[PDB]
Design an enzyme around this catalytic site. Structure first.
Site, mmCIF file in Angstrom:
data_model
loop_
_atom_site.group_PDB
_atom_site.id
_atom_site.type_symbol
_atom_site.label_atom_id
_atom_site.label_comp_id
_atom_site.label_asym_id
_atom_site.label_seq_id
_atom_site.Cartn_x
_atom_site.Cartn_y
_atom_site.Cartn_z
ATOM 1 N N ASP A 101 44.083 4.653 38.190
ATOM 2 C CA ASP A 101 45.382 5.341 38.190
ATOM 3 C C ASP A 101 45.243 6.826 37.831
ATOM 4 O OD1 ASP A 101 46.987 3.087 38.934
ATOM 5 O OD2 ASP A 101 48.188 3.132 37.111
ATOM 6 N N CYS A 118 46.108 7.817 51.674
ATOM 7 C CA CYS A 118 46.324 7.460 50.274
ATOM 8 C C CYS A 118 47.815 7.655 50.045
ATOM 9 C CB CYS A 118 45.412 8.293 49.373
ATOM 10 S SG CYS A 118 45.301 10.097 49.768
ATOM 11 N N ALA A 143 49.447 10.960 49.409
ATOM 12 C CA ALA A 143 49.757 12.181 50.163
ATOM 13 C C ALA A 143 48.858 12.393 51.383
ATOM 14 C CB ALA A 143 49.648 13.412 49.241
ATOM 15 N N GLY A 144 47.731 11.702 51.468
ATOM 16 C CA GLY A 144 46.807 11.887 52.581
ATOM 17 C C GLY A 144 45.933 13.129 52.515
ATOM 18 N N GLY A 181 43.967 13.873 49.060
ATOM 19 C CA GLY A 181 43.033 13.802 47.938
ATOM 20 C C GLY A 181 41.901 12.799 48.083
ATOM 21 N N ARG A 182 42.154 11.525 47.743
ATOM 22 C CA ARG A 182 41.191 10.450 48.039
ATOM 23 C C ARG A 182 40.812 10.420 49.521
ATOM 24 N NH1 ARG A 182 44.524 5.771 44.621
ATOM 25 N NH2 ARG A 182 44.903 7.130 42.805
ATOM 26 N N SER A 183 41.796 10.621 50.390
ATOM 27 C CA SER A 183 41.536 10.625 51.830
ATOM 28 C C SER A 183 40.537 11.710 52.203
ATOM 29 C CB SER A 183 42.844 10.828 52.592
ATOM 30 O OG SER A 183 43.743 9.719 52.483
ATOM 31 N N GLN A 216 42.025 17.451 45.860
ATOM 32 C CA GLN A 216 43.191 17.913 45.098
ATOM 33 C C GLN A 216 42.855 18.420 43.698
ATOM 34 O OE1 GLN A 216 45.613 14.137 45.725
ATOM 35 N NE2 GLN A 216 47.294 15.595 45.839
#
Ligand SMILES: CNc1ncccn1
EC number: 3.1.3.48
Length: 282
Positions: free
Chosen positions: A181, A215, A217-218, A220-222, A262
């Protein structure tokens, strides 16, 4: 500089925030006028995350062709990706329309539906075989075929039917379920294992349309997923793998979608993943 020793040099000097801010300063700025039209306000999850006009995915519709999604086309690596936000209650039908129209084989999901006690995306796929979903606005039907739950991720086989033509296709859903998280994972080992499973499925290969990755927002992790994949592929293709410059690759990708990676912690994690991944490849 090489990667692994540039890495230790930033750790010892504690300058990750300064490196990351340089990237933010140099990143491209292109217009996103379609995203900001008033008729599209309920198609965007976050007001500060929008697709550029030049690289946005267009729906094959004459009323409103807008979705918050971008085509990242990596020329030297010969890979393409669609990066998009987690679907909203009023865009789940648009999402599956895109998957259909772009001929994607796989969908990569890097978030949980609920995180930090709040909803991060809609429940956009069916959870039981006998309870299929129908999207009436785009005339598609979606059925859960099978599900394989592992300790760090789940893989689902789905059937997508275009109800207008009765054509059907098999879509693979790759769901990474253990990103924390807050912060980033301590080790990149399970993320890399997940990337390799997506690769092995064929979902990233040229005989299919681009993979769809999201993810919340598409960006960061993405962003971490496609940056690691492309860097590792370039290290396999080139005569000199130490020439691969992860900051340059990231700036290239930011020509196609704003904001990729991010936080400085996500940047450090991307370096770690590429470094460890390059040892396993050989
Ligand atoms: C660089 N990636 C690649 N190269 C050749 C064929 C397929 N992919």
């Amino acid at each position: 500089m090489e990667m692994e020793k540039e890495f230790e040099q930033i750790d010892k000097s504690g300058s990750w925030a300064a490196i990351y801010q340089d990237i933010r300063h140099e990143a491209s700025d292109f217009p996103s006028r379609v995203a900001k039209l008033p008729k599209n306000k309920n198609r965007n999850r976050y007001r500060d995350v929008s697709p550029f006009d030049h690289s946005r995915i267009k729906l094959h519709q004459e009323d409103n062709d807008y979705i918050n999604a971008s085509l990242i086309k990596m020329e030297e690596a010969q890979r393409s990706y669609i990066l998009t936000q987690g679907p909203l209650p009023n865009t789940v039908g648009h999402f599956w329309e895109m998957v259909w129209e772009q001929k994607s084989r796989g969908v990569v999901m890097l978030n949980r539906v609920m995180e930090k006690g709040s909803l991060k995306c809609a429940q956009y796929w069916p959870q039981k075989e006998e309870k299929e979903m129908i999207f009436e606005d785009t005339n598609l039907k979606l059925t859960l075929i099978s599900e394989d739950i592992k300790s760090y991720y789940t893989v689902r086989q789905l059937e997508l039917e275009n109800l207008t033509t009765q054509e059907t296709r098999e879509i693979l859903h790759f769901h990474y379920t253990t990103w924390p998280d807050f912060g980033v994972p301590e080790s990149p080992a399970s993320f890399l294992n997940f990337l390799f499973k997506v690769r092995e499925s064929g979902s990233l290969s040229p005989e299919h349309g681009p993979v769809v990755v999201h993810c919340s927002a598409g960006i960061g992790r993405s962003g971490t997923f496609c940056l690691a994949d492309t860097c590792l592929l370039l290290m396999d293709k080139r005569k000199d793998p130490s020439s691969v410059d992860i900051k340059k690759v990231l700036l290239e990708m930011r020509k196609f979608r704003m904001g990729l990676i991010q936080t400085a912690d996500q940047l450090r994690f991307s370096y770690l993943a590429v470094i460890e991944g390059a040892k396993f490849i050989m």
